[PDB]
C-alpha cells in the first residue's frame, strides 16, 4: 500500500489575488553590515557559544538543501552546509549544530519564539516577513518555476489553470500560485518531498516552487522536468529573531567570508550543478 503525504489538503477555491505592488520591495534584501573587529563578532555570539551548539531550524523535505542522506543517515544539503559555516565561525569547526525540525509554515514562529538561533531553510527574504523576523544578506537567489512529468503538456503558467498544483503551506510559492487566473486546484502539503510523492502517485499534476527545490525533486525523479518562465524572485536569507541584530551582523560576516574564500563556490558545485555552472555568489546589500 502506497505512501501518502500526511497533511495533504485541497484548498478552498478562492478568487485570484492581484499581484502585490502594495509593499512590493521595501528593499527587503538590504541587511546589517558585519562587525569590523573579531572581538565584537565573538561577543555577539557569546550566548550561543556558551550553549555549546548552534540551533538551526530546517527540515528534511528539501533534497539538495536539507534532507537525510539515505547512505550516511545524516542531515545534509546546501542549507545544512551554509549553517555549518556559521557554526565554524562561532566554534572553530562546523560540527557544533543541533537541528530543530520545522516546516516551512513554522519558520517565522520559531524565530519569534527564540526556539532556534537561525533558520536556514530556503527562506525567501520578503517585506512582509521582515515585519516579523530579521534576515542576513542573500546567500542564494532562486526563481519560482513549474515541475511536471515529461509527458505533461504543461509548459507555461496559464496551463496550470484548473489543474492540480502542489505547494507547501506557509510559502511564497502558494502566494504566487494564488495569483493565477483562472485558479489552479491548489493542493497543499507540509514539505516539498510530499509534493513529489503526490506527483509520483498521480494525485496532482504539477509542482510550483523555487527552481532550486524543483531541481532537487528532478534529481530524485528524473521522469520530471522543469518548465515555464521565471514566476517570482526568491532571494534566500538566513532567518534571525527580529531583535538579534548582533547575530545578523555575525552571520553577514560569515557570508562575506564564504563568498570570498571559495567556500560558497565549493558548496554550489557540491550540491547545485544540476542547475548549471556556478554563478558568482549573490552580491550582498547593506542598509548601513
Ligand atoms: N523560498 C520560498 C518557497 C520555498 C520554501 O521556502 O519552502 C519561501 O521562502 O517560502
Residue numbers in the entry: 41 to 328
Publication text:
The conserved aspartate-specific solute-binding protein (SBP) GlnH links extracellular amino acid concentration to PknG activity via the periplasmic transmembrane protein GlnX, thereby controlling glutamate metabolism in Mycobacterium spp. GlnH belongs to the solute-binding protein family, specifically the polar amino acid binding family, which bind to arginine, cysteine, histidine, glutamine, glutamate, and aspartate. The fold of GlnH is related to bacterial solute-binding proteins from ATP transporters and to the sensor domains of glutamate receptors: two lobes close around the Asp ligand in a Venus flytrap-like arrangement. We propose that the amino acid concentration in the periplasm is sensed by GlnH and that protein-protein interaction allows transmission of this information across the membrane via GlnX to activate PknG.
To determine the structural basis of discrimination between higher- and lower-affinity ligands, GlnH was crystallized in the presence of Glu and Asn. The greatest difference is in loops 99 to 103 and 109 to 113 (DIGSN and DPITG, respectively), which are displaced 2 Å in the Glu- or Asn-bound structures compared to the Asp-bound structure. The conformations of the ligand binding site and positioning of the ligands are similar. Contacts between GlnH and Glu are the same as those between GlnH and Asp, with the liganded Glu adopting a bent conformation such that the side-chain carboxyl group occupies the equivalent position to the side chain of ligand Asp in the GlnH-Asp complex. Glutamate and aspartate were identified as the stimuli that lead to rapid phosphorylation of GarA. Sequence alignment of GlnH homologues that are also genetically linked to PknG shows that within the order Actinomycetales (which includes important human and animal pathogens like Mycobacterium leprae and Rhodococcus equi), conservation of the residues that contact the R group of the Asp/Glu ligand predicts that these proteins are also likely to be specific for Asp and Glu.
